[PDB]
Amino acid sequence: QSYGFRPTYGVGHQPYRVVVLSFELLHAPATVCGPKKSTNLVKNKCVNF
Amino acid sequence: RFASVYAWNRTRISNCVADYSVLYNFAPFFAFKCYGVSPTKLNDLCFTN
């Protein structure tokens, strides 16, 4: 049924465009990633991976 | 004629089926925060008063 909007409506009735981002950071092959610079890889030495 | 805060208006509710979902169009509802009782499943609760 109709969901009409009028500018004269007050708060709580004005349209509220909503975008919700769903993540799945569950340990699995990761693709979408942030802007962190990749460094060289080092073996047999204690590091903060 | 909403009463002033110093003399607030108390209203008795008696035997009735109160649907807490038709009141969303009665007020702008800037904030609908609620305490121990949640309005989500409120329509499934029976009150002494």
From Swiss-Prot, chain A:
Effect upon mutating Q1Y: Reduced host ACE2-binding affinity in vitro
Record's function text: Attaches the virion to the cell membrane by interacting with host receptor, initiating the infection. The major receptor is host ACE2. When S2/S2' has been cleaved, binding to the receptor triggers direct fusion at the cell membrane. When S2/S2' has not been cleaved, binding to the receptor results in internalization of the virus by endocytosis using host TFRC and GRM2 and leading to fusion of the virion membrane with the host endosomal membrane. Alternatively, may use NRP1/NRP2 and integrin as entry receptors.
Effect upon mutating Q1R: In strain: Omicron/BA.1, Omicron/BA.2, Omicron/BA.2.12.1
Designated name of the protein: Spike protein S1
Gene: S
Source organism of this protein record: Severe acute respiratory syndrome coronavirus 2
Record's subunit section: Binds to host ACE2. RBD also interacts with the N-linked glycan on 'Asn-90' of ACE2. Cleavage of S generates a polybasic C-terminal sequence on S1 that binds to host Neuropilin-1 (NRP1) and Neuropilin-2 (NRP2) receptors. Interacts with host integrin alpha-5/beta-1 (ITGA5:ITGB1) and with ACE2 in complex with integrin alpha-5/beta-1 (ITGA5:ITGB1). May interact via cytoplasmic c-terminus with M protein. May interact (via N-terminus) with host bilirubin and biliverdin, thereby preventing antibody binding to the SARS-CoV-2 spike NTD via an allosteric mechanism.
Stretches for region Disordered: 27-49
